[PDB]
Symmetry: C2
Subunit: 218 residues, 2 copies
């Protein structure tokens, strides 16, 4: 893999969104990875529907939390509609996927990045954005404004975000994270998270639970 | 269905191509329908590879003829590459589909339009372009320049073309056919073929063997 990569610069990342007061982070993270792989495979960057996952992934809890695996499986099985067609409401309603037009973007399946390992993480991120989990509940994380964040934070995973690149700055290796708290949080909605080397759980548990979808066709 | 329809006007038809001195009409017809459904489903008009079918559909005979069913099945199973990536050579070579990048457009499957019936034909053409067979070997068909062609021609099917619309002109109902003989033949590469009413084999056997692909995902 290269010394650095930024999928935003490669046109595989849509603008920062805001989950509002709804615990739909799991949906946002899954959608960002799907938007990314769709662009990488087809060349087109489409904004996909987090709302469809919120309403339709029956294995998740809408605004009360959900899972990376079940939401990615949902897209692999059913495809996902565009957000234009199924816009975000920050609330869970009845699944309305069927009454929807436009295309349904589908993925073939998803894989798990071998955990707690910087090398595996970078090797996979060099190919496409990853859905990752982090402990974001601590005060420092919440109030992050800029720079390479290195805590303090533990590994009590409670938030799903999207890794969209990595690199180094001022003698510090980092990972670019796209959060779903709007453009006012952090560095225009992103955070450069310190990259722990080798075999470790990662800063705020970033290497513990990473997944990526794979898409073989258009 | 409407009184008339023209998929060219709806942006679902790529420019007229020329099979050259290669009996790859079957590949051209299949590709035109796939290009059409892809646009209808995804909104993007991509030019797909006839060459991939020529080289890769092992059930067909390259430049010596082939089938509507086997070529459509090929795309349903393997998807098809863009022509940019796998350009036409008017000759059959080794299948080179695997060493190719870019996306592979796939279809879910294909269906047969109930034969010898104007109503079924129009009902299906109102939804998307159709792969149809016609007897094009006769002198009149070969030398067609303009107007609503109504023969003479029999029903000895020997050529595959694409139906891309229908309508009426000067008291005559017709079907718009996209041929693969270049832009100099007929009406800029197209032919308005007389539409026989009801239960009949159609002018030049146009209602005898029509198929269309269906695509459920992007």
């Amino acid at each position: 893999y290269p010394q650095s990569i930024d999928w935003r610069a490669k046109g595989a990342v849509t603008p920062v969104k805001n989950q509002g007061a709804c615990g739909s982070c799991w949906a946002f993270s899954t959608i960002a990875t799907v938007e990314g792989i769709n662009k990488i495979v087809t060349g087109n960057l489409l904004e996909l529907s987090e709302q469809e996952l919120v309403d339709c992934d029956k294995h998740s809890y809408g605004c009360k939390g959900g899972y990376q695996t079940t939401s990615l499986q949902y897209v692999a099985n059913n495809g996902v509609h565009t957000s234009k067609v199924y816009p975000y409401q920050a609330k869970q309603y009845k699944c309305r996927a069927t009454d929807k037009p436009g295309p349904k973007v589908k993925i073939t399946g998803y894989k798990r990045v071998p955990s707690n390992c910087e090398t595996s993480f970078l090797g996979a991120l060099a190919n496409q954005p990853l859905s990752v989990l982090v402990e974001a509940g601590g005060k420092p994380f919440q109030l992050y404004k800029s720079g390479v964040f290195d805590g303090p934070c533990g590994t009590k995973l409670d938030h799903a975000v999207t890794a969209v690149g990595y690199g180094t700055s001022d003698g510090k290796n980092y990972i670019i994270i796209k959060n779903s708290w709007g453009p006012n949080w952090g560095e225009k909605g992103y955070m450069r998270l310190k990259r722990q080397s080798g075999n470790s759980q990662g800063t705020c548990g970033v290497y513990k639970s990473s997944y990526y979808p794979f898409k073989g066709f258009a």
